[PDB]
Amino acid sequence: MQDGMYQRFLRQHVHPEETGGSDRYCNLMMQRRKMTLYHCKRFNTFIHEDIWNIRSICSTTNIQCKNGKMNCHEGVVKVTDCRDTGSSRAPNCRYRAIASTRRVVIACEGNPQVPVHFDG
Ligand SMILES: O=c1ccn([C@H]2C[C@H](OP(=O)(O)O)[C@@H](CO)O2)c(=O)[nH]1
Structure with missing residues (x-):
């Protein structure tokens, strides 16, 4: 399950080669990554850092998740937050x-530790 959740975290939140930063990028990416398939995902973060840099975050000390568990970690990274505008529906989502x-x-x-979910 951690291997299927890890790939999904990859499809949804990672893009090291680019640096996005624009609505047009959010509109393209959100769709290339299959997040407007049936509904316009409300909010989503794309991390623009090397995969090994995101895995390296799992090693930082432990902190509480929004759910109360303590298997959460934090790191300061370059991202592009994509917020649905609410204008149109899928498959034409605008961000x-x-x-x-x-x-x-x-x-x-x-084990080995891998990122399986974006807390915030
Ligand atoms: O800064 C934020 C906040 C939230 N989310 C997504 C992740 C979760 O959905 P997901 O597991 O499908 O990515 C959900 C609640 O955090 O919103 C982001 O991508 N970035």
Whole structure:
């Protein structure tokens, strides 16, 4: 399950080669990554850092998740937050982008540890 949840976390939140930062990027990416298939996912973060840098976050000290578990970690990374505008429905979803280098919190599971969920 951690291997299927890990690939999904990959499809949904990672893009190291690019640096997005625009609505147009959010509109393209959200669709290339299959998140507007049936409904316009409300909010989504794309991390623009090397995969090994995201795995390296799992090793930081442990902190509480929004759910109460303690298998969560934090790191300051470059991201592009994609916010649905609410205008149109799938498959034509339109997004608003926001760039910043900010603090993200992900959940890691398994052995070796891998990111399986984006807390916030
Ligand atoms: O900064 C944020 C906040 C939330 N989410 C997504 C992740 C979760 O859905 P997901 O597991 O399907 O990615 C959900 C609640 O955090 O919103 C992001 O992508 N970025």
